[PDB]
Amino acid sequence: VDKRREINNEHPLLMMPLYANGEEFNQGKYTFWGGDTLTGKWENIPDDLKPYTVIQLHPDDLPKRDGAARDFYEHMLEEAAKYVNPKTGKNEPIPVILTVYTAGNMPYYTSAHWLSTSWIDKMYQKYPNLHGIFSTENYWIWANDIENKAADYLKVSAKNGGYFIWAEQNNGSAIEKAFGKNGKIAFQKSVDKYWKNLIFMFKNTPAAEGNDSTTESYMKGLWLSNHTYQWGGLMDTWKWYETGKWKLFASGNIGKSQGDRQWLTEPESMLGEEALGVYLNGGVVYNFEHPAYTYGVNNKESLLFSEVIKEFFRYVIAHPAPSKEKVLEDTKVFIHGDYSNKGNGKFFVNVNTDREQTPLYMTGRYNVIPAIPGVLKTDIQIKEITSPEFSSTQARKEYLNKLYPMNYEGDIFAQKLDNRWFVYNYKVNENVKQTGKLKFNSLEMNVEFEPHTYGIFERISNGLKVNLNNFRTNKDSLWSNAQDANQAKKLPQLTKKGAIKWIEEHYIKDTQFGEKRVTKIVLRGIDKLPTIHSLSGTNNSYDQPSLNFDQKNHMVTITINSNGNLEFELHF
Numbered sequence: 001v002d003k004r005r006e007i008n009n010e011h012p013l014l015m016m017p018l019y020a021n022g023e024e025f026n027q028g029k030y031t032f033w034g035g036d037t038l039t040g041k042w043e044n045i046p047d048d049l050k051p052y053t054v055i056q057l058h059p060d061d062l063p064k065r066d067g068a069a070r071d072f073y074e075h076m077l078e079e080a081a082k083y084v085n086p087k088t089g090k091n092e093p094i095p096v097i098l099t100v101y102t103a104g105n106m107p108y109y110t111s112a113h114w115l116s117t118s119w120i121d122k123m124y125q126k127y128p129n130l131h132g133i134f135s136t137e138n139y140w141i142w143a144n145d146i147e148n149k150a151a152d153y154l155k156v157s158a159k160n161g162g163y164f165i166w167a168e169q170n171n172g173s174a175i176e177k178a179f180g181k182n183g184k185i186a187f188q189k190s191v192d193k194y195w196k197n198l199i200f201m202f203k204n205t206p207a208a209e210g211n212d213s214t215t216e217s218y219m220k221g222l223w224l225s226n227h228t229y230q231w232g233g234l235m236d237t238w239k240w241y242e243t244g245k246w247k248l249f250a251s252g253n254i255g256k257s258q259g260d261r262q263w264l265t266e267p268e269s270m271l272g273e274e275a276l277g278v279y280l281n282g283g284v285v286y287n288f289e290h291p292a293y294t295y296g297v298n299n300k301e302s303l304l305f306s307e308v309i310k311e312f313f314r315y316v317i318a319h320p321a322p323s324k325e326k327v328l329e330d331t332k333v334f335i336h337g338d339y340s341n342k343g344n345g346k347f348f349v350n351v352n353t354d355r356e357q358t359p360l361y362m363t364g365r366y367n368v369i370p371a372i373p374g375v376l377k378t379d380i381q382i383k384e385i386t387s388p389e390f391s392s393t394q395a396r397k398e399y400l401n402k403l404y405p406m407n408y409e410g411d412i413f414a415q416k417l418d419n420r421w422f423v424y425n426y427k428v429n430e431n432v433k434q435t436g437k438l439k440f441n442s443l444e445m446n447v448e449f450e451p452h453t454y455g456i457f458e459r460i461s462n463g464l465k466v467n468l469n470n471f472r473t474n475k476d477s478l479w480s481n482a483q484d485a486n487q488a489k490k491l492p493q494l495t496k497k498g499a500i501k502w503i504e505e506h507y508i509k510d511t512q513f514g515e516k517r518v519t520k521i522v523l524r525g526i527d528k529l530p531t532i533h534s535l536s537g538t539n540n541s542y543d544q545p546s547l548n549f550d551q552k553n554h555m556v557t558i559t560i561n562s563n564g565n566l567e568f569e570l571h572f
């Protein structure tokens, strides 16, 4: 009954994936794709991050037969258990999560098929450093006993004080079915008893089906109604492949033809825009794919990891996400019903998303509207999804606009928490600048952002604290020798091994950094020239900000030219 770890706003969780190399396993070697090792990966995690990070083992392409996954996982659990910190010479067992269920655990899809609940119980009992087990991506192969198995995973975790973590997207009603929509109620009943040992996360991989908004809505609503202990999201750069995108901003669609070039191409800073939807809504668990780009290779941090994810995760440790009680205090509408019956992701298009195929929001006015599936009972206006207010786009906005007042101006994403404005440009693959006007009392701030740019603006006693992130390296070289989408489609495959080698050769080193680009901040109602203090950021990535003070009009325009992360304070 005693929890093996805490997971909450004060103790968030960053999952650190390590994917088994099946070819090398057949040869009697225990290795991970990308050349990370269990011990070296752990060692290389900043010490300040170690208490909030857990190694997640994934069996990837281990042989699909009995014993392969048990053998690999036992080897790695042993390595983790006997780890010695050297500095301190002390045995400090590495915390681990095992991937136990994926692709419906079909024997033609995964070695995880041959991991029994009996075996999981035995591992929990043997290894105190085993903190949880992980189910991921089953929406497209929704197996006959998936809900029964999920109950067993939750029960066996609760019995041992560990967590059952499930990452899933609402394609084909997956989240609704999980709780009993179609009559499979084992997991619903398991949750009734064991919700404090459950973590439920979105998995935004299937971007072409547009279920980002509805899945996140459910994750939040499940949390708020005590159907999961905490929630989070797995954010996946394979979304670029799923939607058929190629060179940044280029026109034309290539479909699913260049996988390994495609999962490299999503702007680094855009993962931070995705992750803000988790943070701003009380979520505390974070995970990413493709691991080589989002985390790194060979026990080294990728620039995406170092410049975006690590900065972002440090921010949410230093500023804990809003508590359940706070999020619940702020909630004005809570939806009860099935999004699958109301157009799915279409439900929020032109309400707070700009298109079907996006992991972003276009306004923070309503933040994320929480919901639970209609099969669940309750247990703030609680509104049935079939109520007249939700029948159309315009009905949704009119109803919500009475309960959620307009709190900023401009076509841009922004959301306010206490003294902090959170802002991003919501464009995905269109090179359009956006502007907003935000207020702290009193103080009036305009901003102008290019795409793939987020900022956090905190009113402090002597001014304004600013965190900016627009880190975006140049991926054009991956798309060399292709003048249009037809040509790009026909490029030689980069290949899985080739992409790992590209990261080693041209991303970890010899980086093709993006161009510096302009952000404008305009302060109004200003008496004298503000000063800049505590200026730091990504190495060699920003010019000294330029100020222009218009004394009469009580305004200062600050021009930043940068490509990276950045922070400073303005005193005024």
Ligand SMILES: C[C@@H]1O[C@@H](O[C@@H]2[C@@H](O[C@H]3O[C@H](CO)[C@H](O)[C@H](O)[C@H]3O)[C@@H](O)[C@@H](CO)O[C@H]2O)[C@@H](O)[C@H](O)[C@@H]1O
Binding pocket: 019, 033, 058, 060, 061, 102, 103, 136, 137, 205, 238, 241, 242, 289, 290, 291
């Ligand atoms: C069923 C699902 O399989 C894996 O995700 C795939 C993904 O697989 C490739 O990339 C991953 C790392 O991101 C591994 O290297 C795999 O070996 C690769 O084959 C892609 O094929 C995407 C395309 O959208 O589809 C996903 O299904 C795995 O990462 C998941 O956790 C899950 O087990």
